[PDB]
Curated annotation (Swiss-Prot):
Its EC number is 3.5.4.2. Transmembrane segments: none annotated. It comes from Pseudomonas aeruginosa (strain ATCC 15692 / DSM 22644 / CIP 104116 / JCM 14847 / LMG 12228 / 1C / PRS 101 / PAO1). The active site is at E196. Binds 1 zinc ion per subunit. This is Adenine deaminase. Its cofactor is Zn(2+). Catalyzes the hydrolytic deamination of adenine to hypoxanthine. Plays an important role in the purine salvage pathway and in nitrogen catabolism.
């Protein structure tokens, strides 16, 4: 663990909203004078049992209620950056879901201000390079995403890319082809969630329609040999999230996970925590799980860590 924790890493698949520790949620609710449904930290913490992606999302979005002021968004981001320092993550390219907040009345400028301020401290104080990624909510309409992109334009230099998260199944990448087209035209790089719960086809769509630079999750690509051969050949990065896949039942067990298999075949896989506050582990806890349940070696450890550095945008 300590050896794993000492490795220099880059986290390329992480939702800032998914770093909302139960404790923080309660503290922010207190500061905002919000009455929580949950009786105590422990009660919220045991609500963290998921049968699938959606059950997690429902709670995930619920917690986002406490995020209301700039200082809120700073605290959220700064807390995570401190974890990064602790676990020697030297570079971050995090997600956030502006719609989750803007649809709640919180000004776009307020959300960005808080996060940006934290990112600034992260680099000058902690020496952590950042690349903010704006993610669209895929269960919502492409029109709603277009309206979000319009908000983002004056801010565009604050984002290295646009992403796509939320309920995958039934909301294929193609649904957002237009806004992604416009995003790139406006100077955004692109990434996307594909093949978490969705089929290999969704991954092809991400690659060819949304023209992403990397696939987020992408584990279901294992079902498609033709796709696998492309991945290996094009060295397109995959931001794999071990604990997330386990907690969401993508794999019935960590021993079932295919990330090492992919690694040995030549796929540019990386290790990420995704939604750490919800899956009970940050990036180091993810590396560790691979070691305990898959007998991962230091050898493959150095390699995964390196890929994450290489796959920086
Ligand atoms: O990992 C994820 N998958 C889909 N939607 C999400 N919203 C936060 N994390 C995720
Ligand atoms: Zn994710």
């Amino acid at each position: 663990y300590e050896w794993l924790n000492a490795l220099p890493k880059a986290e390329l698949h992480l939702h800032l909203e998914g770093t909302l520790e139960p404790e923080l949620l309660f503290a922010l609710a207190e500061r905002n004078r919000i009455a929580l449904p949950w009786n105590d930290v422990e009660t919220l913490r045991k609500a963290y049992a998921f049968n699938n992606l959606q059950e997690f999302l429902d709670l995930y979005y619920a917690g986002a209620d406490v995020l209301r002021t700039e200082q809120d968004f700073y605290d959220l981001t700064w807390a995570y950056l401190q974890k990064c320092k602790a676990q020697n993550v030297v570079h971050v390219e995090p997600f956030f879901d502006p719609q989750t907040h803007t649809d709640r009345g919180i000004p776009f400028e307020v959300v960005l201000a808080g996060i940006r301020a934290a990112l600034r401290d992260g680099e000058k104080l902690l020496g952590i390079r950042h690349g903010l990624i704006l993610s669209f909510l895929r269960h919502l309409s492409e029109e709603q995403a277009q309206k979000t992109l319009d908000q983002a334009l004056p801010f565009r230099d604050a984002f290295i890319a646009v992403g796509l998260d939320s309920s995958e199944v039934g909301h294929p990448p193609s649904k957002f082809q237009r806004v992604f087209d416009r995003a790139r035209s406006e100077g955004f790089l692109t990434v996307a969630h594909a093949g978490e719960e969705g089929p290999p086809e969704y991954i092809w769509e991400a690659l060819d329609l949304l023209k992403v630079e990397r696939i987020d999750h992408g584990v279901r690509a294992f079902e498609d040999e033709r796709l696998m051969r492309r991945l290996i050949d094009e060295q397109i990065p995959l931001t794999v999230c071990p604990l997330s896949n386990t907690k969401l039942c993508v794999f019935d067990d960590m021993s079932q996970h295919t990330i090492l298999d992919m690694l040995e075949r030549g796929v540019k896989v990386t290790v990420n925590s995704d939604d750490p506050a919800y899956f009970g582990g940050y990036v180091t806890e993810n590396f560790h799980a691979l070691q305990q349940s898959l007998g991962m070696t230091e050898e493959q450890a150095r390699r995964l860590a390196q890929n994450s550095l290489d796959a920086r945008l």
